[PDB]
Design an enzyme around this catalytic site. Structure first.
Site, PDB file in Angstrom:
ATOM      1  N   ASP A 167      -4.407   0.252  -4.366  1.00  0.00           N
ATOM      2  CA  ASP A 167      -4.088  -0.512  -3.141  1.00  0.00           C
ATOM      3  C   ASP A 167      -2.719  -0.260  -2.883  1.00  0.00           C
ATOM      4  O   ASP A 167      -1.738  -1.199  -3.608  1.00  0.00           O
ATOM      5  CB  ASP A 167      -4.494  -1.795  -3.175  1.00  0.00           C
ATOM      6  CG  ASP A 167      -4.399  -2.726  -2.080  1.00  0.00           C
ATOM      7  OD1 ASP A 167      -4.137  -1.932  -1.070  1.00  0.00           O
ATOM      8  OD2 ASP A 167      -4.715  -3.926  -2.003  1.00  0.00           O
ATOM      9  N   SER A 169       4.997   5.090  13.330  1.00  0.00           N
ATOM     10  CA  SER A 169       4.486   6.264  13.939  1.00  0.00           C
ATOM     11  C   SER A 169       5.148   6.413  15.363  1.00  0.00           C
ATOM     12  O   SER A 169       5.660   5.508  15.956  1.00  0.00           O
ATOM     13  CB  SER A 169       3.297   5.978  13.859  1.00  0.00           C
ATOM     14  OG  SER A 169       2.583   7.073  14.651  1.00  0.00           O
TER      15      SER A 169
END
Length: 330
Positions: free
Chosen positions: A35, A199
Site C-alpha cells: 500500500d 498530473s
C-alpha cells in the site's frame, strides 16, 4: 541489494493485489497488500481476536526465534474506506522477494474491522508511503522501504501491476525490460506523507487532451481512480446510460456499454487507461448495472491514482533525498 516479488490480484476484478512476504525465523509467509498510501506493516496474528479471523494466515511471533516485543508500542490505523486495525508491535526479520530487513516493525493486529475479516485472501498490509504516516506510538517506526533503502542498489521501488494478471514489485532497481519508451519523472510532495504529485491533465477516449493540474496520490492500496467531479462527469458523459447512483455509492453504467479509455498526463507524457480497466462488473451478482472504475474524489479530500490508473503504467517510486515518481507505458 535488490528484491523482486510477484503481486497477484485477489479476485477477478483486481480489487487488490497480494504479495508474499516472509516474516520471522523460520520464515512465516503472509500474503500482504502493498500500500503506497499508508506506512504501517501490520499482520493478522496469533493475537488477533479469534472472531475477527476468517481464513487469513496469521503471524505467530512466539514461533519466531528473531521476534522481539517492541515493549510499550501500540498502533491504530483508519483507512480511506472506513476500515481499521490496531494492536501491538514486534520487531522481526522481514524479506520481500529476496530483500531482507532485520529489525522491521511488524504491527500485530489485536483488532481488525469487518472488511479485513471478510477478505480471507489478505493477511495484512505493507505500507510504502513515507514513514511520517506510521501510526506506532510512542516511537514512530520506519517502513520496510525506509529500512531497506541504505542497502538497496538504488533507493527506488517499482510497481508493475497487472490487469487481470500478476505483476511485480521490485526494490532497488529499475527493470528496463518491463516498460516501453522512456520513464517520465514528476515531482513529489511529501508534505502529507504520500507519494503526492500533479498530473498535467486528461483526455476521455479519443477526445482532446485537457491541460489542467490535478494533484493526487499514487496509491497501490486503493482499487479505483478518484478524480475531481468535473473530470469524472466528463468521462461518464461519454457512456450512454451512465449515472451517479447515491444508492450504489458512485457512477454505474449499463453492462452492455463499451467504455472509452481515459488518458492522464505525466509532464508532457500520457498514460492511457484502456476502457476495459474501468469496468468493475455488476454491482450485485447478475445485475445489468456495472460499477465504474473512475469515481469522484469530492467526498475524500484528495485525488487518488489507485490501481485502475497505476496498472496502466510501470511506476517508479524514487525515494532519493528529493523523491520523485516516474511513469512509463508498458
Amino acid at each position: 541489494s535488490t528484491g523482486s516479488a510477484t503481486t497477484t490480484p485477489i479476485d477477478s476484478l483486481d480489487d487488490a493485489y497480494i504479495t508474499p512476504v516472509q516474516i520471522g525465523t523460520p520464515a512465516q509467509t503472509l500474503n500482504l497488500d502493498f500500500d503506497t498510501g499508508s506506512s504501517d506493516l501490520w499482520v493478522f496474528s496469533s493475537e488477533t481476536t479469534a472472531s475477527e479471523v476468517d481464513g487469513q494466515t496469521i503471524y505467530t511471533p512466539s514461533k519466531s526465534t528473531t521476534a522481539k516485543l517492541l515493549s510499550g508500542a501500540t498502533w491504530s490505523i483508519s483507512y480511506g474506506d472506513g476500515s481499521s486495525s490496531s494492536g501491538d508491535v514486534y520487531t522481526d526479520t522481514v524479506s520481500v522477494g529476496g530483500l531482507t530487513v532485520t529489525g522491521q516493525a511488524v504491527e500485530s493486529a489485536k483488532k481488525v474491522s469487518s472488511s479485513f475479516t471478510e477478505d480471507s485472501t489478505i493477511d495484512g498490509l505493507l505500507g510504502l508511503a513515507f514513514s511520517t504516516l506510521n501510526t506506532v506510538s510512542p516511537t514512530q517506526q520506519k517502513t520496510f522501504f525506509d529500512n531497506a533503502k541504505a542497502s538497496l542498489d538504488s533507493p527506488v521501488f517499482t510497481a508493475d501491476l497487472g490487469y487481470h494478471a500478476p505483476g511485480t514489485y521490485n526494490f532497488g532497481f529499475i527493470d528496463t525490460t518491463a516498460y516501453t519508451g522512456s520513464i517520465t519523472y514528476t515531482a513529489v510532495s511529501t508534505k502529507q506523507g504520500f507519494w503526492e504529485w500533479t498530473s498535467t491533465g486528461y483526455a476521455v477516449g479519443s477526445g482532446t487532451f485537457k491541460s489542467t493540474s490535478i494533484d493526487g496520490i499514487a496509491d497501490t492500496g486503493t482499487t479505483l481512480l478518484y478524480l475531481p467531479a468535473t473530470v469524472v462527469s466528463a468521462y461518464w458523459a461519454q457512456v450512454s446510460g451512465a449515472k451517479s447512483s447515491s444508492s450504489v455509492g458512485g457512477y454505474v453504467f449499463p453492462c452492455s456499454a463499451t467504455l472509452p479509455s481515459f488518458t492522464f498526463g505525466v509532464g508532457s507524457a500520457r498514460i492511457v487507461i484502456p476502457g476495459d480497466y474501468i469496468d468493475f462488473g455488476p454491482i450485485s451478482t447478475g445485475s445489468s448495472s456495472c460499477f465504474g472504475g473512475i469515481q469522484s474524489s469530492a467526498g475524500i479530500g484528495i485525488n487518488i491514482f489507485g490501481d485502475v490508473a497505476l496498472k496502466a503504467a510501470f511506476v517508479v517510486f524514487n525515494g532519493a533525498t528529493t523523491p520523485t515518481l516516474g511513469f512509463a507505458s508498458k
